């Protein structure tokens, strides 16, 4: 960082350097004849280089009026970065996760230099290989991109065009793969508290296995035991069952997926009648998607609307479909399906058209990653049957890959023909 | 940029900064100064760090995979041959660890907010600021309009397939 | 155009989910290969290798014949008209296709559902997988026509165990599918009636992995063991007699055993040997024994030199005489240019193996894309 | 180990038989057989002295039984045979390195990008070539470990003290059925 006293020092030095350059040029001119009418009254009073003097007079007056704390921070003017809202704990956990992996790496390289036997050296070399292939491994897609970038720096003309397009496609694919990989535990969250997760699941798994062996042994010794010892073993077995039930509860943590948006489609108050009156509960229908072809939905019922929405949010990542899109912006062909009495039409569109849909269809198509589709809901506009008809329609589209596999023939886009 | 001062004392400080801009000599000397050169170098490094969010260092490793491997081959060959019967070992370890740290360290998005920069419309407008005069020579771009609206919000109006560079 | 509608009928294409099959459908010539058929086959296989949506390829035959070899009547009529260019072009096209089959980047499977002769084995046996049936009969009767077992037949016969390659290339002996499994020339075996089952299984595999294809072919294949009367139970006779240095030594030793032991197999093998041209027997033995210690591009190179010498009628006209006697006049009694084995000299058989590229000529050599294909088989 | 040496003997006999028949043309075949036996006896004596390395690295003194041109031709034929074996084993390793799953997935990604034709084939052969280099460096490290282990074991003992030419072997679908 830079101290404010250092800033005052450098601005005073700059004003001084202006004065020194003015006097040095005045000296150089004045020694060689050369009257200084362009130095005096041309860099002092009648320069007016930016028209900044009224701004100086306005700022000078506003600096001698009020009192506060002179070193009090305030709200910034050119603030609102707005993408600076990411949870900082995950990011500051990434730092020391990488640091622990790097320290382990440095320890194995220092152990490789402390061996005495080449059998030991080979063993630590294989340990280093198994470490690097599991924690510092570069994905092969980045090797393809690096080779293509090597061809690109010396390419020109048509080859430069074609390589730029290919690397653009590759960069999109690797960014998507890194952001939405289900195997990376960094792509998961906790939801409100309803390799660390790996080891915290392994310890519970080993505890459950130990409790199951103990319970089997105690049931075995309960089968041949009669009397008060039988009752004491029964109480011991009940305590073991309680421990195992609590440990099984502790493994059920619902996870949300990062990079997904979840939206409410419908919150409804339903009712049931008893002799004491009406019993009123809430149902919530919600959809989720990652804007990259993955879409899901869930319906939940609870006592309040908030609780129903929360249960649906926990359930929404449990039924995810993958939807194929044409060129990441539209569907391959026109599709018409019906679910019960809800008829849905979808039409593909060129690339500057937009989305023409009602709110349920628009929300689902937006979350699946589409950009240019026209649609029409004909008949009943039940929102849940509309959701189901949208998922039925998007799974009945036959892509050119599908046609190519179904008919054993090559399918070509017509503009490449 | 590196002078994140409180409001009132920066407002008192701006008078001294405004006096330096009163003359052409002051603007010339501000341009040719080690202050703005340090600011420029820090902003260059800051712009370099933001590229790692796109996995830039992984592309750098993918370009240079063979020689990065050859460093490890050299280290293993030396630590086999000159050990089967130490500044070389320390030098090779320092180099390999420096390379592994430079190629494997994840992107670090700091707390400090990014400074918002003025855009120049050089894709379709050619300007000579001396007179000033300008000539239109091309068409505008949908991704270069300098609005402060996020992409996910504005996609509800544009419906653009972003990432190809085209006006789509 | 419209004139190529017959060639597209002669080489059909059947497409499956991730695989293509080439079908030979020339029933007049028993699926004999012509120059446009080889050109179409080469175009198809090049396009299918380039296509990343195709996992593996197939080669089948329609009818009771898989492939009866090359169509030599057109070459005979071309040689009769003076110019030798048509035979040349047919030969480098055929050897180029065989080289493509030997170096092919995707898995290739051949279904051998009938008689396979000559270059019919040459387009299929260099492949990765080979399926033999109970109708599969493999023979190499090139010496009895006045020609040599070309199209890579000096590559895979020379690599059989013992000296069985020499026996097959000199006698023209029939091999069955079980025996072809035993010799290692066929990878898998299934009955003819069970081929729709394997063909439906193979068609809708969506795998690139050769291990998955091998496991599927073995799982749907049939388990067979060679019979007691098989050729391979007489392999020690082959190594005893056909391992001699020259052809006349083999004939003399077999004649001596026929005089002493009266072996019926020896009499039948003599009746097999005596029906061949004396020149091509020696060229065949030399090329079989030379091809044991060299790669496929080299084998196809000197096979091209032998073919291009045999069609120019430089030292003999046994090619045209054998073709005429056994295909045109059909009296089946040819008269070779040397009637006897002893008339054939060392200088005559060295004219077939000479570096014709040293005669200030370029198209007398076989071109092969060894730099682009970067051979690995 | 018998297969490699037997292939070397077969290639060497096949070349040197023609070389001897060209060299001494007037002599009969039995003299050629005897000289081939003497030549192969001297070559296997060289191999049993110091392996295949000294047959291709630096020429020793010639034996007085043969001439200097004969030993030079034998040396060049041995070099040619070992180079043919090196090329053949390299191609047989490329057979399984082209189809290796890392190269297969890199080629899958490259073809999914749009890289086809000759550029894809070139990149496939390249990636197989760096995999071959990595595995041969690994094998050289393994061989060096073995040799240093054996020599250190032998040095520490002093401190710790005080092809049938045509036999069938039937195998179908990876199931060896050679038993009687
Ligand atoms: Mg209505």
Q: Map D24-45 to HEC letters.
A: CCCCCHHHHHHHHHHHHHHHHH
Listed in sequence order, the DSSP H helices in A77-139 are 88-112, 118-135
- CB-based contacts of C250, cutoff 8 Å, min separation 6: C170, C241, C242, C244
- CB-based contacts of C61, cutoff 8 Å, min separation 6: C23, C24, C31, C67, C111, C112, C113, C114
Rounded-to-integer distance, Cα C280 and Cα C306, Å? 10
SS3 of residue A274 by DSSP: strand
Residue D174 contacts C, CB cutoff 8 Å: yes
Length of chain D: 180
- Which partners does chain B have (≥3 C-beta pairs < 8 Å)? A, D
Which residue from A minimizes the CA distance to D106?
A140
Rounded-to-integer distance, Cα B11 and Cα A63, Å? 7
Partner A, chain D 92-111, Cβ-Cβ below 8 Å: 102, 105-106, 109-110
Rounded-to-integer distance, Cα B55 and Cα B59, Å? 7
Q: Left, alpha or beta for C30 (phi > 0: left; psi -120 to 50: alpha)? A: left
> What residue has token string 């890289």?
D115
Rounded-to-integer distance, Cα C57 and Cα C16, Å? 10
**C-alpha angle with apex C94: C90 to C96, nearest 5 degrees?**
120
- Interchain proximity C16–A407, CB inside 8 Å: no
Q: Each residue of A95-127: b (16+ CB within 10 Å) or e?
A: eebbeebbeebeebbeebbebeebeebbebbee
DSSP lists the bridge partners of residue A266 as A285
Query: Nearest Cβ partner of B80 from D130, D134, D141?
Result: D141
Strands B125-128 and C56-61 turn out to be: unpaired
- Interchain proximity B66–D144, CB inside 8 Å: no
Alpha carbon of A341 to ligand 1 centroid (Å): 11
Local structure of residue A342 (DSSP, 8 states): E
CA C68 to chain centre: 10
Q: Which of B80, B68, A16 is nearest to D144 (CA)?
A: B80
Breaks (C-N over 2.5 A) in chain A follow: 194
- Which helix H or strand E contains C59, and what residues bound it? strand C56-61
Question: In this structure, are residues A258 and A187 in contact, taking their beta carbons and an 8 Å threshold?
Answer: yes
Interface test mutation site (partner D, options A137, A140, A145, max chain D beta carbons within 10 A): A140
Interface test mutation site (partner B, options D145, D148, D153, max chain B beta carbons within 10 A): D148
- Interchain proximity C182–D167, CB inside 8 Å: no
Rounded-to-integer distance, Cα C24 and Cα C60, Å? 7
- CB-based contacts of A386, cutoff 8 Å, min separation 6: A339, A342, A344, A360, A361, A377
Which residue from D minimizes the CA distance to C292?
D11
Rounded-to-integer distance, Cα B156 and Cα A355, Å? 9
Strands A261-274 and A277-289 turn out to be: antiparallel
Distances (CA, A) of A16 to A12, A48, C86: 6, 19, 95
Question: In this structure, are residues C372 and D118 in contact, taking their beta carbons and an 8 Å threshold?
Answer: yes
SS3 of residue C21 by DSSP: strand
* Residue A209 main-chain phi, psi, to 5 deg: -65, -40
Strands A342-348 and A261-274 turn out to be: unpaired
Query: Nearest Cβ partner of D117 from C50, C289, C292?
Result: C50
Breaks (C-N over 2.5 A) in chain B follow: 85
Size of interface A-D (CB pairs under 8 A): 37
- Interchain proximity B80–D144, CB inside 8 Å: yes
Q: Left, alpha or beta for B67 (phi > 0: left; psi -120 to 50: alpha)? A: alpha
Rounded-to-integer distance, Cα B118 and Cα B115, Å? 10
Strands A294-302 and B133-136 turn out to be: unpaired
Rounded-to-integer distance, Cα A370 and Cα A325, Å? 7
Length of chain C: 377
Rounded-to-integer distance, Cα A121 and Cα A27, Å? 75
SS3 of residue D172 by DSSP: coil
Listed in sequence order, the DSSP H helices in C206-277 are 210-220, 235-241, 247-260, 264-273
Strands A277-289 and A294-302 turn out to be: antiparallel
SS3 of residue A194 by DSSP: coil
Rounded-to-integer distance, Cα C174 and Cα C165, Å? 12
CA C255 to chain centre: 29
Cβ-defined contacts of C353-362 (< 8 Å, 24+): C353/C286, C353/C287, C353/C290, C353/C302, C353/C305, C353/C306, C354/C305, C354/C309, C355/C305, C356/C305, C356/C308, C356/C309
Resolution in A: 2.1
Distances (CA, A) of A138 to B148, C148, D114: 36, 54, 22
Question: In this structure, are residues B97 and A109 in contact, taking their beta carbons and an 8 Å threshold?
Answer: yes
Alpha carbon of B159 to ligand 1 centroid (Å): 31
User: Which token pair is A117?
Assistant: 């036997």
Tell me chain B's radius of gyration from C-alpha atoms: 25
- The dihedral sign for the CA sequence D12, D10, C103, D140: negative
Within a 10 A sphere around the Cβ of C46, how many other Cβ atoms? Answer: 12
Strands A294-302 and A320-322 turn out to be: antiparallel
> What residue has token string 């496991």?
C215
Burial of C151 (0-12, 13-18, 19+ CB in 10 A): buried
Residue D18 contacts C, CB cutoff 8 Å: no
Rounded-to-integer distance, Cα A416 and Cα A191, Å? 48
Rounded-to-integer distance, Cα B70 and Cα B76, Å? 10
> What residue has token string 């060096």?
D144
Counting Cα atoms < 13 Å in the Cβ hemisphere of A86 gives 15
* Residue C274 main-chain phi, psi, to 5 deg: -70, -10
User: Which token pair is B61?
Assistant: 């490793």
SS3 of residue C368 by DSSP: coil
Rounded-to-integer distance, Cα B47 and Cα C202, Å? 54
Q: Cis omega (within 30 of 0) on the bond before B132? A: yes
- Interchain proximity D144–B69, CB inside 8 Å: no
Residue D121 contacts C, CB cutoff 8 Å: yes
Residue A413 contacts C, CB cutoff 8 Å: no
Alpha carbon of A354 to ligand 1 centroid (Å): 27
Question: In this structure, are residues C28 and C44 in contact, taking their beta carbons and an 8 Å threshold?
Answer: no
Alpha carbon of A361 to ligand 1 centroid (Å): 18
Local structure of residue C311 (DSSP, 8 states): H
Question: Which residues does chain A have within 8 Å of residue B164's beta carbon, measured at their own beta carbons?
Answer: 168
- CB-based contacts of C288, cutoff 8 Å, min separation 6: C149, C154, C157, C158, C165, C166, C169
Say how many Å lie between the first and final Cα of chain B, rounded. Answer: 35
User: Which token pair is A203?
Assistant: 């310890």
Rounded-to-integer distance, Cα B127 and Cα B131, Å? 10
- Interchain proximity C14–A404, CB inside 8 Å: no
* Residue A287 main-chain phi, psi, to 5 deg: -125, 155
Rounded-to-integer distance, Cα A91 and Cα D72, Å? 71
User: Which token pair is C363?
Assistant: 């198209």
- Which partners does chain D have (≥3 C-beta pairs < 8 Å)? A, B, C
Question: In this structure, are residues A129 and D138 in contact, taking their beta carbons and an 8 Å threshold?
Answer: no
CA dihedral D43, D44, D46, D52 (to 10 degrees): 90
Q: How many helices (H) and strands (E) does chain A have?
A: 12, 7
Q: Each residue of B21-49: b (16+ CB within 10 Å) or e?
A: ebbebbeebbeeeebeeeeeeeeeeeeee
Rounded-to-integer distance, Cα C253 and Cα C237, Å? 11
Rounded-to-integer distance, Cα C26 and Cα C10, Å? 5
Rounded-to-integer distance, Cα D47 and Cα D40, Å? 10
Tell me chain D's radius of gyration from C-alpha atoms: 23
* Residue C283 main-chain phi, psi, to 5 deg: -65, -40
Rounded-to-integer distance, Cα A61 and Cα A405, Å? 79
Rounded-to-integer distance, Cα C230 and Cα C176, Å? 9
DSSP lists the bridge partners of residue A335 as A346
Rounded-to-integer distance, Cα C365 and Cα C362, Å? 6
Question: Which residues does chain D have within 8 Å of residue B70's beta carbon, measured at their own beta carbons?
Answer: none
Question: Which residues does chain A have within 8 Å of residue B104's beta carbon, measured at their own beta carbons?
Answer: 98, 102, 136
Interface test mutation site (partner D, options C47, C50, C52, max chain D beta carbons within 10 A): C52
* Residue A264 main-chain phi, psi, to 5 deg: -80, 130
Alpha carbon of A379 to ligand 1 centroid (Å): 6
Question: In this structure, are residues A332 and A400 in contact, taking their beta carbons and an 8 Å threshold?
Answer: yes
- Which partners does chain C have (≥3 C-beta pairs < 8 Å)? A, D
Instruction: Sheet with C115-117: list strands edge to edge.
Output: C65-67, C115-117, C137-139, C175-176
Counting Cα atoms < 13 Å in the Cβ hemisphere of C118 gives 23
Alpha carbon of A305 to ligand 1 centroid (Å): 28
Q: Left, alpha or beta for C117 (phi > 0: left; psi -120 to 50: alpha)? A: beta
User: Which token pair is A50?
Assistant: 């930016």
SS3 of residue A302 by DSSP: strand
Q: Each residue of D9-38: b (16+ CB within 10 Å) or e?
A: eebbeebbbebbeeeeeeeeeeebeebbee
Question: Which residues does chain C have within 8 Å of residue A401's beta carbon, measured at their own beta carbons?
Answer: 53
Question: In this structure, are residues C369 and D120 in contact, taking their beta carbons and an 8 Å threshold?
Answer: no
Helix axes B56-63, A140-152, angle to 10 degrees: 70
Question: In this structure, are residues C173 and C180 in contact, taking their beta carbons and an 8 Å threshold?
Answer: no
Strands C108-112 and C175-176 turn out to be: unpaired
Listed in sequence order, the DSSP H helices in A224-266 are 228-250
User: Which token pair is C198?
Assistant: 């394997």
Instruction: Sheet with A261-274: list strands edge to edge.
Output: A261-274, A277-289, A294-302, A320-322
Local structure of residue A278 (DSSP, 8 states): E
Burial of A287 (0-12, 13-18, 19+ CB in 10 A): buried
Question: In this structure, are residues A289 and A221 in contact, taking their beta carbons and an 8 Å threshold?
Answer: no
Question: In this structure, are residues C109 and C53 in contact, taking their beta carbons and an 8 Å threshold?
Answer: no
Rounded-to-integer distance, Cα A63 and Cα A71, Å? 14
User: Which token pair is A206?
Assistant: 């080993």
Tell me chain C's radius of gyration from C-alpha atoms: 21
Rounded-to-integer distance, Cα D121 and Cα D103, Å? 11
- Interchain proximity A405–C15, CB inside 8 Å: no
Rounded-to-integer distance, Cα B52 and Cα B17, Å? 35
Rounded-to-integer distance, Cα D164 and Cα A303, Å? 85
- CB-based contacts of C368, cutoff 8 Å, min separation 6: C96, C99, C297, C300, C301
- Which helix H or strand E contains D110, and what residues bound it? helix D101-113
Distances (CA, A) of C69 to C116, C118, C337: 7, 5, 24
Q: Cis omega (within 30 of 0) on the bond before C304? A: no
User: Which token pair is C277?
Assistant: 């041209």
Query: Nearest Cβ partner of A166 from D113, D126, D148?
Result: D113
- Deposited experimental method: cryo-EM
Burial of A382 (0-12, 13-18, 19+ CB in 10 A): middle
CA dihedral C296, C297, C302, C306 (to 10 degrees): 80
Rounded-to-integer distance, Cα B1 and Cα C271, Å? 100
Residue D67 contacts A, CB cutoff 8 Å: no
- The dihedral sign for the CA sequence A160, A161, A162, A165: positive
Alpha carbon of A285 to ligand 1 centroid (Å): 23
Question: Which residues does chain C have within 8 Å of residue D112's beta carbon, measured at their own beta carbons?
Answer: 52
Within a 10 A sphere around the Cβ of A318, how many other Cβ atoms? Answer: 10
Q: Which of C372, C304, C284 is nearest to C89 (CA)?
A: C304
Tell me chain A's radius of gyration from C-alpha atoms: 35
Burial of C105 (0-12, 13-18, 19+ CB in 10 A): middle
- Interchain proximity B168–A72, CB inside 8 Å: no
Rounded-to-integer distance, Cα A250 and Cα C117, Å? 72
User: Which token pair is B147?
Assistant: 């609005």
């Amino acid at each position: 960082t830079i101290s404010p006293a250092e800033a005052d020092r450098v601005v005073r030095d700059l004003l001084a350097e202006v004065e020194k350059e003015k006097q040095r040029e005045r000296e150089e001119r004045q020694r060689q004849g050369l009257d200084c009418k362009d130095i005096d009254d041309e860099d002092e009073d009648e320069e007016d280089y930016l028209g900044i003097e009224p701004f100086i007079e306005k700022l000078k007056k506003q600096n001698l009026k009020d009192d506060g704390e002179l070193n009090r921070r305030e709200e910034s003017s050119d603030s609102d970065s707005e993408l600076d809202e990411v949870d900082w704990d995950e990011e500051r956990k990434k730092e020391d996760m990488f640091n622990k992996k790097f320290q382990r790496h440095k320890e194995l390289l220092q152990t490789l230099t402390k061996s005495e036997t080449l059998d030991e050296a080979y063993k630590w070399m294989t340990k280093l290989d198994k470490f690097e292939e599991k924690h510092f491994k570069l994905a092969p897609e980045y090797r393809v991109i690096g080779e293509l970038m090597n061809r690109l720096k010396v390419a020109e003309g048509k080859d430069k065009f074609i390589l730029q397009q290919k690397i653009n496609r590759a960069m999109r694919l690797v960014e998507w793969k890194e952001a939405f990989d289900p195997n990376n535990p960094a792509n998961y969250g906790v939801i409100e508290r309803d390799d660390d997760m790996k080891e915290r699941d392994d310890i519970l798994l080993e505890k459950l296995n130990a409790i199951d062996k103990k319970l089997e042994s105690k049931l075995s010794e309960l089968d041949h035991t009669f009397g008060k010892k039988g009752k004491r073993l029964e109480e011991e077995i009940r305590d073991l069952a309680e421990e195992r039930n609590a440990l099984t509860e502790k493994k059920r943590q619902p996870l949300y997926r990062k990079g997904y948006d979840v939206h409410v489609i419908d919150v409804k108050k339903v009712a049931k009648v008893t002799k004491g009156g009406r019993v009123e509960r809430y149902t919530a229908l919600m959809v989720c998607g990652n804007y990259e072809g993955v879409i899901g939905y869930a319906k939940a019922k609870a006592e309040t609307g908030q609780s129903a929405m929360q249960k649906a949010y926990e359930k929404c990542f449990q039924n995810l479909h993958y939807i194929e899109r044409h060129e990441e912006h539209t569907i391959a062909h026109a599709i018409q399906t019906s679910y019960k009495k809800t008829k849905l039409y979808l039409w593909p569109a060129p690339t500057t058209t937009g989305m023409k849909a009602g709110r349920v269809v628009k929300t689902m198509l937006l979350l699946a990653g589409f950009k240019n589709i026209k649609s029409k809901v004909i008949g009943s506009r039940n929102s849940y049957n509309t959701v189901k008809a949208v998922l039925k329609a998007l799974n009945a589209v036959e892509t050119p890959k599908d046609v190519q596999e179904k008919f054993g023939r090559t399918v070509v886009e017509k503009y490449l023909l | 940029k590196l002078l994140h001062q409180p409001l009132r004392m920066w407002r008192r400080s701006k008078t001294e900064w405004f006096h330096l801009l009163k003359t052409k000599r002051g603007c010339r000397l501000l341009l040719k100064s080690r202050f703005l050169q340090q600011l420029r170098s820090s902003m260059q490094e800051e712009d370099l760090e933001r590229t790692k969010k796109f996995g830039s260092e992984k592309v750098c490793l993918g370009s240079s995979f063979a020689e990065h491997k050859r460093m490890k081959r050299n280290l293993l060959k030396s630590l086999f041959l000159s050990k089967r019967r130490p500044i070389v070992y320390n030098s090779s370890l320092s180099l390999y660890s420096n390379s592994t740290y430079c190629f494997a360290s994840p992107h670090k998005l700091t707390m400090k907010r990014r400074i918002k920069r003025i855009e120049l419309p050089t894709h379709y407008l050619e300007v000579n600021y001396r007179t000033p005069k300008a000539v239109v020579f091309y068409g505008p771009n949908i991704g270069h309009i300098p609005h402060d609206i996020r992409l996910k919000d504005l996609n509800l109006l544009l419906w653009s397939r972003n990432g190809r560079g085209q006006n789509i | 155009s419209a004139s190529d509608a017959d060639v597209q009928d002669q080489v059909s294409v059947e497409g499956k989910a991730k695989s293509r099959a080439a079908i030979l459908d020339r029933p007049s010539s028993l699926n004999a290969l012509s120059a446009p058929m080889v050109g179409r086959l080469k175009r198809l296989y090049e396009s299918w290798e380039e296509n990343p949506a195709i996992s593996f390829v197939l080669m089948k035959g329609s009818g009771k014949t898989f492939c009866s070899g090359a169509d030599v009547l057109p070459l005979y009529h071309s040689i009769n008209e003076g110019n030798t260019e048509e035979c040349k072009h047919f030969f480098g096209s055929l050897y180029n296709f065989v080289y493509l089959q030997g170096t092919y980047l995707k898995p290739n499977i051949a279904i051998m559902d009938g008689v396979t002769m000559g270059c019919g084995g040459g387009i299929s046996i260099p492949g990765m997988f080979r399926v033999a049936t109970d109708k599969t009969v493999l023979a190499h009767p090139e010496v009895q026509i006045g020609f040599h077992p070309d199209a890579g037949a000096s590559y895979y016969l020379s690599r059989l165990p013992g000296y069985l390659g020499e026996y097959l290339a000199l006698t023209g002996q029939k091999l069955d599918g079980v025996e072809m499994i035993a010799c290692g020339l066929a990878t898998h075996f299934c009955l003819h009636s069970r081929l729709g089952m394997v063909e439906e299984r193979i068609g809708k595999l969506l795998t690139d992995d050769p291990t998955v294809i091998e496991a599927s072919l073995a799982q749907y294949s049939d388990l067979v063991y060679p019979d007691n009367t098989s050729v391979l139970h007489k392999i020690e006779m082959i190594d005893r007699y056909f391992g001699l240095d020259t052809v006349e030594e083999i004939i003399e030793a077999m004649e001596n055993e026929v005089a002493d032991s009266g072996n019926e197999w020896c009499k039948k093998t003599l009746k097999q040997v005596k029906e061949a041209s004396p020149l091509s027997l020696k060229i065949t033995l030399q090329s079989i024994r030379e091809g044991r210690f060299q790669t496929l591009d080299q084998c196809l190179t000197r096979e091209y030199r032998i073919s291009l010498c045999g069609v120019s009628k430089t030292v003999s006209g046994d090619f045209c005489e054998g073709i005429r006697a056994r295909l045109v006049d059909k009296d089946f009694a040819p008269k070779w240019d040397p009637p006897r084995l002893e008339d054939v000299s060392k200088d005559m058989v060295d004219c077939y193996f000479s570096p014709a590229t040293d005669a200030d000529d370029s198209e007398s050599e076989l071109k092969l894309p060894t730099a682009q294909r970067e051979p690995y088989f | 180990e018998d297969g490699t040496t037997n292939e070397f003997l077969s290639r060497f006999v096949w070349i040197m038989r023609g070389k001897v028949s060209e060299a001494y043309p007037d002599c009969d075949k039995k003299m050629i057989d005897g000289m081939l036996l003497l030549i192969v006896e001297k070559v296997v004596e060289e191999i049993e002295r110091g392996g295949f390395n000294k047959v291709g690295s630096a020429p020793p003194s010639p034996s007085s039984e043969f001439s200097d041109d004969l030993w030079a031709t034998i040396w060049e034929v041995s070099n040619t045979v070992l180079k043919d074996m090196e090329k053949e084993r390299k191609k047989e390793k490329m057979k399984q390195y082209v189809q290796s799953p890392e190269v297969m997935e890199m080629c899958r990604f490259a073809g999914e990008i749009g890289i086809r034709g000759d550029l894809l084939r070139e990149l496939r052969f390249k990636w197989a070539r760096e995999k071959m280099d990595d595995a041969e460096f690994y094998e050289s490290l393994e061989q060096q470990r073995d040799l240093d282990n054996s020599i250190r074991e032998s040095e520490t003992v002093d401190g710790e003290v005080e092809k049938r030419k045509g036999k069938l072997k039937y195998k179908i679908y990876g199931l060896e059925l050679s038993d009687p």
